[PDB]
Design an enzyme around this catalytic site. Structure first.
Site, PDB file in Angstrom:
ATOM      1  N   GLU A 122       0.780  -1.209   0.000  1.00 47.28           N
ATOM      2  CA  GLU A 122       0.000   0.000   0.000  1.00 47.28           C
ATOM      3  C   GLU A 122       0.820   1.271   0.000  1.00 47.28           C
ATOM      4  O   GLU A 122       0.283   2.260  -0.432  1.00 47.28           O
ATOM      5  CB  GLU A 122      -0.799  -0.027   1.329  1.00 47.28           C
ATOM      6  CG  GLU A 122      -1.816  -1.154   1.224  1.00 47.28           C
ATOM      7  CD  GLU A 122      -2.823  -0.948   0.088  1.00 47.28           C
ATOM      8  OE1 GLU A 122      -2.904   0.038  -0.613  1.00 47.28           O
ATOM      9  OE2 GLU A 122      -3.665  -1.910  -0.088  1.00 47.28           O
ATOM     10  N   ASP A 157      -6.142   6.597  -5.125  1.00 44.40           N
ATOM     11  CA  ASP A 157      -5.596   5.271  -5.202  1.00 44.40           C
ATOM     12  C   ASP A 157      -5.602   4.811  -6.643  1.00 44.40           C
ATOM     13  O   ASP A 157      -5.875   5.638  -7.521  1.00 44.40           O
ATOM     14  CB  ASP A 157      -6.395   4.406  -4.238  1.00 44.40           C
ATOM     15  CG  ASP A 157      -7.764   4.108  -4.755  1.00 44.40           C
ATOM     16  OD1 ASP A 157      -8.243   4.519  -5.782  1.00 44.40           O
ATOM     17  OD2 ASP A 157      -8.347   3.214  -4.033  1.00 44.40           O
TER      18      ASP A 157
END
Ligand SMILES: [Cl-]
Ligand SMILES: [Cl-]
Ligand SMILES: [Kr]
Ligand SMILES: [Kr]
Length: 162
Positions: free
Chosen positions: A11, A20
């Site tokens: 991540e 994202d």
């Protein structure tokens, strides 16, 4: 290695709101803020999550706290899902980390839809599961990550992460 290090690798860590891979407002260690296109919306949810007026920026400690909550919630979600739990309970510790990774990324619901893959994992047919898991949007959208998690279910080791 463990679940935390694993996910911190997949991540990253960003202290300002960012978009994202799907274009959604996120912050920290993959903490999804909202699917809405509104940055204000995102800022509002951030403040709510942290408990102060952040102005879209957080500290490292705050990112880590959100991370701990998110891992925790991912585990509890699996244990609470009738489709997920049996599978997860049948896995070894390494493979359980891979299952948590998937849940953190796409939600329990999302994961719970890999019906065929799930049964293969439950039966310990590793290579077969690996092949079935790659036949997915997930894999075509984030192939490097998918490959790491896939190898992890395949071998039961952390090799993909060294
Ligand atoms: Cl929250
Ligand atoms: Cl990727
Ligand atoms: Kr699972
Ligand atoms: Kr799965």
């Amino acid at each position: 290695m463990n679940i935390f290090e694993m996910l911190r690798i997949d991540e990253g860590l960003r202290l300002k709101i960012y978009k994202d891979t799907e274009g959604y407002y996120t912050i920290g260690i993959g903490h999804l803020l909202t699917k809405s296109p509104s940055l204000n919306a995102a800022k509002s949810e951030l403040d709510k999550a942290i408990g102060r007026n952040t102005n879209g920026v957080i500290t490292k400690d705050e990112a880590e706290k959100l991370f701990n909550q998110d891992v925790d919630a991912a585990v509890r979600g699996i244990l609470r899902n009738a489709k997920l739990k049996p599978v997860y309970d049948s896995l070894d510790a390494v493979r359980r980390a891979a299952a948590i990774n998937m849940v953190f990324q796409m939600g329990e619901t999302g994961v719970a839809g890999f019906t065929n893959s799930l049964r293969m994992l439950q039966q310990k047919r590793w290579d077969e599961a690996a092949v079935n898991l790659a036949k997915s949007r997930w894999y075509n959208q984030t192939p490097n990550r998918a490959k790491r998690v896939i190898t992890t279910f395949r071998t039961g080791t952390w090799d993909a992460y060294k």
